[PDB]
Amino acid sequence: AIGLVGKKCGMTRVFTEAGASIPVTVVEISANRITQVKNTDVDGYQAIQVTTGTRRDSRVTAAQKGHFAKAGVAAGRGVWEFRANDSDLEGREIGGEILADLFEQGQMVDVTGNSKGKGFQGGVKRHNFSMQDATHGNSVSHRAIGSTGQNQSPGKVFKGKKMPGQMGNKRVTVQGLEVISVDVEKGLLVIKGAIPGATGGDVIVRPSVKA
Amino acid sequence: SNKHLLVQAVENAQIIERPSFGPGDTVVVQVKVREGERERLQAFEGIVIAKRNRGLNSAFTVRKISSGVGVERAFQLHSPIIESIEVKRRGAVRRAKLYYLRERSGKSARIREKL
Amino acid sequence: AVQKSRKSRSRRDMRRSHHHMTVAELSVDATTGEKHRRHHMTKDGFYRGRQLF
Amino acid sequence: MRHRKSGVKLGRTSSHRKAMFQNMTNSLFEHELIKTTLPKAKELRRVAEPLITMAKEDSVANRRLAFSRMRSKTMVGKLFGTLGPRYQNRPGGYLRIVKCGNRDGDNAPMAYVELVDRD
Amino acid sequence: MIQVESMLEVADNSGARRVQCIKVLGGSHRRYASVGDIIKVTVKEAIPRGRVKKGDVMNAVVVRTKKGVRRPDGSVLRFDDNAAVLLNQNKAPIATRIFGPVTRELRGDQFMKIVSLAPEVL
RNA sequence: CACAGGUGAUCAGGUAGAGAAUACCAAGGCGCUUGAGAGAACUCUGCUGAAGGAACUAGGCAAAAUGGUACCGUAACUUC
RNA sequence: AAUUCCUUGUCAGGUAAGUUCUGACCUGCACGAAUGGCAUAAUGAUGGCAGCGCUGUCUCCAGCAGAGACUCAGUGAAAU
RNA sequence: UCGAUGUCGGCUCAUCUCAUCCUAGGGCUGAAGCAGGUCCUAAGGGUAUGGCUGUUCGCCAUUUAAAGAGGUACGCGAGCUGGGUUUAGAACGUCGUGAGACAGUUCGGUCCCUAUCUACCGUGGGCGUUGGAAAUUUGAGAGGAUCUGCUCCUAGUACGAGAGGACCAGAGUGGACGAACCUCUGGUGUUCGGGUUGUCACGCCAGUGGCAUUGCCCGGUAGCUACGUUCGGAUGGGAUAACCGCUGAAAGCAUCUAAGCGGGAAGCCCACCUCAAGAUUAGAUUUCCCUAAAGAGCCGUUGAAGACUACGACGUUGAUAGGCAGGGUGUGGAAGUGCAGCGAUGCAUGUAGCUAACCUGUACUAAUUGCUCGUUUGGCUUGACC
């Protein structure tokens, strides 16, 4: 139930001997250093905290420097927690190591990332609203929202109405993705599929919850 | 070369050597075909009208006429579906892409030989 | 299109509560000792111990 | 969106933007110190610096190529005569931008563009 | 990518020359038919004293498309025309000669007759 | 109103061009009295568009399309 | 039928499917001969219907360019 | 309501009901099977495109699992349309002597408003959360999602006189819908490369540039993007609806019910995804700091982050951006020179020259240890420990 944090390196293909192209995405896995083990006695729940990447010393606060020093690890670019159970808290000690060995070839994974940000978007792109007529006398409402409600009853707009607003740049999970290849010496994780986000983004790969 | 150096490691292990060819050239591509259980090679002869050079992602489209109707196939260069490619005639064209040949049929859809 | 009642002065000022004048950051040039806008040359053309005139 | 896109618009057509940056490049080559708007100063580097790079080696093809983009025979002569053999051993960064406040007329952020090494 | 009101050549010798798609079958809001997909056609142009006449409503299978058919390696395969082969009430081919190539998407049970009768199969 | 409207006559350069059309220039005259950024939605004005090709719609509205010269050739009908 | 209420009359044609269209019938609510009748070549920014071509009209919208929108500085309305 | 509450239809966008159209669970059947018919439960999803007509509807064609009935100012014109109705022109039929008239017809006929408040979609500022800070988090709760076809197999079995033809199990493949993504297939690609028309200029030739929609045309990088790719809608748990019970008395029998014990639906509550402590009950954990600290901010270089913000990165102890260097990609064969040709032109030098946004590096330029905010051990009461 624990995963690892990597960086989206970009997309490519893997060819099979039958001549099928598999769309894959490449994840750089630096070492996931364990910075804290949360247990039920102290925190009320079981989790593993890891860090990965690096920061320069001038960019790490005194509080975070002490947090990393208590574990014995080097400061990473971020800190991520994975909810675990007694089975997961087996060989996981503070200052310990999590590599790409966590996953096997052919294992289904869930991958989470920040989607690409589209900024402010209209209803047509954000919610697949139909466009109104391009011609036929249509005035200046070609990509307009259309009606936003009923009449006097209810005399308001219902909450959760689909409107323009910020699109993308949100946490998104894609489930049911296959591990195409694992390599740990090079920190390589090759996964079948799309992987939300841009290249260089932080991605979290966990074992698939559908199973 | 255009990608993340770690994408390049995955791409470079997958490269099939093939002979060089340009747009305008007439090529024969041997395509692996699996009917039910046996595998054979089907020939695809025609003019290379376009190609995108993208390393592992390279592709080239070949245009022939098959009994009246014209067919194009955009082969993926480094795909094991491509058993082999051999260049019959070398072309002398003035442009990378020969899309104008789609409106040409006979004595007008012919390109000069390169010597 | 238009209000059904005039806005009260209190509500107009609540809208204006975010209206501030930006205050620039200032430094002292090491050579001339003159005050200047941070990351900007001085009135005399001095910036980070260098002349432009 | 604008993801990974380069270039400026500056409220102009592309023809006007090209002509104005050609004018600014020539003005900077002649006077070696100009005062302009800060976004214009930042975009001036991507046009003026490649001309100095190509003038580092003097040839007929290079001189003609510089004149194709500058259209000032005086500035092309000056470029290939002194500027290239002034930045011969400099790997880029031939001009520096110094912020110099705001314009009186419209409060536009201003900057001086100076050629390095005695402008 | 064949939709309603698109015209197709006839790749067989049923008598038809041009057919018009009046329904893409196989789904409530189904949009396009590709190679191998069953469509309802009206015969717009028929050969004199043929088996089908102008105005028949029948079944056809798309056999080649201008949009093209994708292959597992990522290659695409495009034709210069959109073509169809007329079928009977049980969606079985009604011809004894096929004109022009077809693709391997017709391989299976019902259209094996079209595949065997085609001059060339891709 | 220092207002995209209206206001009679006269003069009539060049290269293309049938042309006082049009394009680019001469003489001459101007840059149209807010600018600077940014480069969201949405609006206006344009350009390009896979496959399809009127399925849109009250209606092909709008758009797209055609477009020159020479020659060949040209139907119903006609008051010739 | 620019005239027919009943009425989308009936029959034929055109479409896969045609309250519109064309042909015909005559049961003309409620045509008809200078408030002219029936036709009619040519003509019409006239009405109806049908095709070819052509297309972002549409399936189903995408990308791009300029002017706004947005931020800064200056000036500074409106109806209510 | 007449000191004005805009009409029908369409478009866009919906929201609710259940008297349920499909899918789900059932009882009865004139239920053999396959199919149905009725009624009970069930509102979680889903629930065509066209031809005609201004139509709603309706008929028709072809589908679909199905093409539900309704409410919402017969939802929705300060969101769009303006075909009909319902101004002024004109005509026909008809009525009137007439001016005129007609739920008769016909051709034609200006749809304004920059949004204050509520609402809603997003995105910030402030303050608070018992000293302050940097992070990581629990989850009271909230939202999203919930559809379904066909093929094979069981099995040509059960059933049936035949015709036909299963349940229950299992395997695969679609349609619609949604999300992410750009490797591929394409689209676009007005600071990329060429070709080319007219004209003007750079003294001239050559070579180039301006202008003509980017002049036009042919390609095309990155990005963005769908029609491309990949993924998702769970077969699980709990309690239930109708319905079916077990045992069982009231009521020696019977009886699902009164005591007690079971089964049971796409529905309910979880489970999946997202948000979530202003959950003022403001939660938890790990570190850091307190005679201006820990930090935060301004400023600067900026980003597949973005309206402004915020958010992410970096500021010399530096690859943050530009440049530069080396690649890649695209275009397709630069200029000059030479050769061949009367010349247009062709060939060679040489896959050349150019090359946006891509990759990998590199301090050359620009990121100034400047300033501001933020302190000084965090009240009291009680208990336990000390």
Q: Report yes or no: A180 and A103 within 8 Å, Cβ to Cβ.
A: no
Q: Is the dihedral of CA A203, A205, A209, A210 positive or negative?
A: positive
Protein CA B70 to sugar C1' H217 (Å): 25
The Cα of B110 is separated from the nearest Cα of chain E by a number of Å equal to 18
Q: Is the dihedral of CA C4, C9, C10, C13 positive or negative?
A: positive
Helix or strand run (H / E) with residue E95: none
The Cα of D98 is separated from the nearest Cα of chain C by a number of Å equal to 7
Question: Which residues does chain D have within 8 Å of residue A118's beta carbon, measured at their own beta carbons?
Answer: 1
Those residues whose C-beta lies under 8 Å from the C-beta of residue B52, and which sit 6 or more positions away, are: B58, B59, B60
C and A touch per CB criterion (3+ pairs under 8 A): no
Resolution of this model in Å is 2.6
CB atoms within 10 A of CB E67: 14
CB atoms within 10 A of CB E1: 13
Closest CA to D85 of D57, D118, D105, D51: D57
Residue of chain A with shortest Cα separation from D1: A118
Q: Between β-strands B82-89 and B69-76, what pairing exists: parallel, antiparallel or unpaired?
A: unpaired
B32 to chain A, any CB pair closer than 8 A? The answer is yes
Q: Is A64 helix (H, G, I), strand (E, B) or coil?
A: helix
CB atoms within 10 A of CB B28: 14
Alpha carbon of E2 to those of A154, B74, E9, E25, E92: distances in Å? Answer: 44, 21, 12, 11, 20
- d(CA D82, CA D55) in angstroms, rounded, equals 9
3-class SS letters over B30-90: EEEEECCCCEEEEEEEEEEEEEECCHHHCEEEEEEEECCEEEEEEEECCCCCEEEEEEEEC
- d(CA A177, CA A189) in angstroms, rounded, equals 12
Closest CA to B8 of A199, A69, A204: A199
Please give the interface size between A and D, counted as residue pairs whose CB atoms are below 8 Å apart: 4
Q: Report yes or no: D41 and D95 within 8 Å, Cβ to Cβ.
A: no
Determined by which method?
Answer: cryo-EM
Task: Please name the amino acid found at residue B46.
Answer: G
Q: Please tell me whether the peptide bond between A23 and the residue prior to it is cis, using omega within 30 degrees of 0.
A: no
Those residues whose C-beta lies under 8 Å from the C-beta of residue B101, and which sit 6 or more positions away, are: B47, B49, B63, B109, B111
Protein CA D10 to sugar C1' H222 (Å): 21
Determine whether B76 is exposed, middle or buried from the number of CB atoms within 10 Å of its CB (0-12, 13-18, 19+). buried
Q: Do B10 and A188 touch (CB under 8 A)?
A: yes
Q: Is the dihedral of CA E43, E47, E53, E55 positive or negative?
A: positive
Q: What does the DSSP assignment read for A169-201?
A: -SEEEEEEEEEEEEETTTTEEEEES--SS-TT-
Cβ of residue A120 near strand F, that is under 7 Å? yes
Q: Is A76 helix (H, G, I), strand (E, B) or coil?
A: coil
Helix or strand run (H / E) with residue C30: none
A55 to chain D, any CB pair closer than 8 A? The answer is no
Closest CA to A9 of B10, B12, B56: B10
Q: What is the dihedral of CA E88, E93, E98, E99, to 10 degrees?
A: 50
Q: Which two tokens stand for residue C53?
A: 């005139």
Angle at C18 between CA C16 and CA C19, to 5 degrees: 65
Q: For A57, which DSSP code?
A: G
Closest CA to E40 of E50, E30, B106, B64: E30
Question: Which residues does chain C have within 8 Å of residue D33's beta carbon, measured at their own beta carbons?
Answer: 52
Q: Is A60 helix (H, G, I), strand (E, B) or coil?
A: coil
List bases, strand H, within 7 Å of protein CB.
11-15, 46-49, 61-67, 72-82, 112-125, 133-139, 143-144, 174-186, 190-191, 193, 202-203, 207-212, 215, 218-235, 272-275, 284-289, 294-307, 313-319, 322-325, 327-336, 351, 353-360, 362, 364-368, 370-371
Residue of chain B with shortest Cα separation from E118: B67
The residues that bridge with A36 in the sheet, in sequence order, are A49
Task: Please name the amino acid found at residue A27.
Answer: V
Q: Report yes or no: A31 and A51 within 8 Å, Cβ to Cβ.
A: no
3-class SS letters over chain D: CCCCCCCCCCCCCHHHHHHHHHHHHHHHHHHCEEEEEHHHHHHHHHHHHHHHHHHCCCCHHHHHHHHHHHCCHHHHHHHHHHHCCCCCCCCCCCEEEEEEEECCCCCCEEEEEEECCCC
Q: For A12, which DSSP code?
A: E
